[PDB]
Design a protein around this nucleic acid. Sequence first.
RNA 1: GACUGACUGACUGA
RNA 2: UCAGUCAGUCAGUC
Lengths: 180, 662
Amino acid sequence: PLRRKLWQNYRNLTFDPVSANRHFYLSRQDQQVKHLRQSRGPGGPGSFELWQVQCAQSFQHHYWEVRASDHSVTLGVSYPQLPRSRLGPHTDNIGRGPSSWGLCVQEDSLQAWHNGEAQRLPGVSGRLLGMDLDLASGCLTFYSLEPQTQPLYTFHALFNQPLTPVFWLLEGRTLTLCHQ
Amino acid sequence: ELQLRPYQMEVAQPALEGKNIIICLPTGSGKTRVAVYIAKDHLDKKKKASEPGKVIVLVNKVLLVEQLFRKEFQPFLKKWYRVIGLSGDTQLKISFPEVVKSCDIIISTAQILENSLLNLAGVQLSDFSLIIIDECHHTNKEAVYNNIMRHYLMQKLKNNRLKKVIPLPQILGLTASPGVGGATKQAKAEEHILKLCANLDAFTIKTVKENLDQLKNQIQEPCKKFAIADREDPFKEKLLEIMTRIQTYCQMSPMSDFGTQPYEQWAIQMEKKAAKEGNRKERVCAEHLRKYNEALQINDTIRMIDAYTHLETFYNEEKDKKFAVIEETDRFLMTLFFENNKMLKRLAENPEYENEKLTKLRNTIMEQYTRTEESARGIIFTKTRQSAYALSQWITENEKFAEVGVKAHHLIGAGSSEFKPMTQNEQKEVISKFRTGKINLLIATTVAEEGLDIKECNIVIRYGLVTNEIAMVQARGRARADESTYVLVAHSGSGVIERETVNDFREKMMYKAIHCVQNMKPEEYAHKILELQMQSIMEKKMKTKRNIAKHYNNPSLITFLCKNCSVLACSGEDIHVIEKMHHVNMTPEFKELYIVREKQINGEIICKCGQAWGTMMVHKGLDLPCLKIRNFVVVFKNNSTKKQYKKWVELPITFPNLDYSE
RNA sequence: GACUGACUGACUGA
RNA sequence: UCAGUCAGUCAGUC
Ligand SMILES: Nc1ncnc2c1ncn2[C@@H]1O[C@H](COP(=O)(O)OP(=O)(O)O)[C@@H](O)[C@H]1O
Ligand code: ALF
Ligand SMILES: [Mg+2]
Ligand SMILES: [Zn+2]
């Protein structure tokens, strides 16, 4: 019932071909993303050097669902000023500075990053995830849907710029959206 | 600051005054520092009463010589005593007995002592006082350690005779898994642990039974995890095509499918019997099918290009040798092989095709490094040198890895006619680069499984390895870091997972069996040990009498024949030896028979056949070519059969040395 | 940097 | 009791 009450603030989303990284691939009317070993041509400008992809939509509340093929993947939201270059060895940028907020899912445990800090959270078996944000209250909440609903975590903040969703994928991993 | 933690003192308390013992703590328990402290108190106590004292540490891998000479003894005893670290690479400027009289802590590889002891002015085992044996479970049926301990036992029995004395040095030994000698029943494990204690001449096992909570805190059981998999590709069956046709040419009997060991063994024996017959048109075919099977097996283990390189590197050198004699059956191979290998080379370069195991390993390495975030060292254990070098290349080439921060290098042992041999100083520089942290995913073979000391290694991966239980108790150990992961990779085709299960069960058996021997009644322990001591000596006498029987020699009786042809080469008298080591010939017509070939400092000999006989080697100003017996056939004059020997010591013949007077 | 020789251990096979 | 691949240890000649 809680997800049903959420669903009247559901919002449809789509990717941006410019922001897609080299080895990644877009599909299903730009609603599903996969990552392959062989390069899809040179990257060029407008593409994040680190392994992320951003959606075309952004929000000036809102809620949605993302299905994930497997673990070791990250979902989050940032301000429009997210850096697109790489200056460090590790290949994920969400949560390193204050300008974003991310949640990384793995086989063992969950890690929610912001301002370069995060805390271990007990792991979850399910793959499907849900996520909500209210700018008026300035809060961002995550949810695990299977088998039951769990309010995994909440972030308090004040926003002066719109938020754009950004996704981080490994090799051999896939990520799909949902629509209604 | 030798302030030992409590349980180390618990285990070392009995050894601190007489009573030669053993000691076993699990990996990460600082056993080496227990050795340090015991040696310190030994030397201090002997000095107080002003009596001569020395200590020798026996290690069994050379890498560990420098490790234990630089990390642990050196700082903790830099001031009070004189410590010297010797090994098999260092070019000593002084003979060993002068070294022993020169210093008083000697860190050495055991084989050096054993050389210096059977040399009869040498050295006698009574000179020393403390004999520390690191990783002493290798004391077993005629190993390098056991010869030393057998001199010790002969002296002990001589003292038991003398009582109706010459003091014997106190012994200490350090282990992590004394192991069971292939035993399915409790009684046999009990027997084996007793036999080990016997050969070391111990008093007990003395494992910590008081401070259990502290020990369970220091040592971390790492997380075990299983990456297992089992893609259509022509290459395996594409080559099955060619090799099936090659077999059909001579219609040989498989007796088993392809890609597995029995087929390779079968090829070996058929080759041998055919060569004994003289049946050409078959020898070359059998050996080529063997090469193809090896290619399939390498294609199993490593990436595809390495298999293709093995094939082409054999064949092009074959044709190079063959076209030198220029300046029926043979052509049948190349005229097929070259079309098919151009096909292969275009086939193998296509990278979307892949092996199965490598994909799982690829997933593991990159995923796990991505999660670590720059606090991550890894060791990948493998089986063959070639595998090590190939994995290093495959890590370097494809560019996705280098962005996630993996920096890789291969570590193998010194001393095989392939890619490039690593040598001693290169290896030392490699582990030196690895300890600080600019080499991050070290790929190693058996050499680094008992002894490495790296304070931080998160990740230990095992690659398609099958082995006994001690080489599995230690390899988990090398992951001496917190939140460690021991990840096993294999495809179910070969018996790797079933081996994992039996090994784990043998680990349980071994621990319980030590607990069993821990608690015997001392009368029984003493008497069983005495009987066990007697047993080894008597069986050595039996083997020695059989050996002096087996050595039994006219050098002129036999004649050597070529092995791919059967054209007579020479007779025994033409053979001589340089320094009992290099078999060589000086004869002039035997010089006109062969053809040098350079593609060079040392030239390879070739027959008319294209098969190789030996190499040119220059001695004391003579230019002279040698011979290798593996490439010939021996024909007697008593029974006209045909025999092959693998290595020169097999042949019952004794050869004279190169009169040099001519 | 190149070439040899010999002890030894684990795995598989009669 | 014999064969077979594999790793490690030592010793010579350039
Ligand atoms: N008194 C001590 N205090 C803290 N750490 C110690 C102490 N003694 C030994 N260690 C640790 O033990 C490690 C050495 O263990 P070692 O005996 O080499 O393991 P293994 O028994 O597998 O060879 C060192 O890295 C050191 O950090
Ligand atoms: F003595 Al160890 F690993 F147990 F070097
Ligand atoms: Mg040790
Ligand atoms: Zn010939």
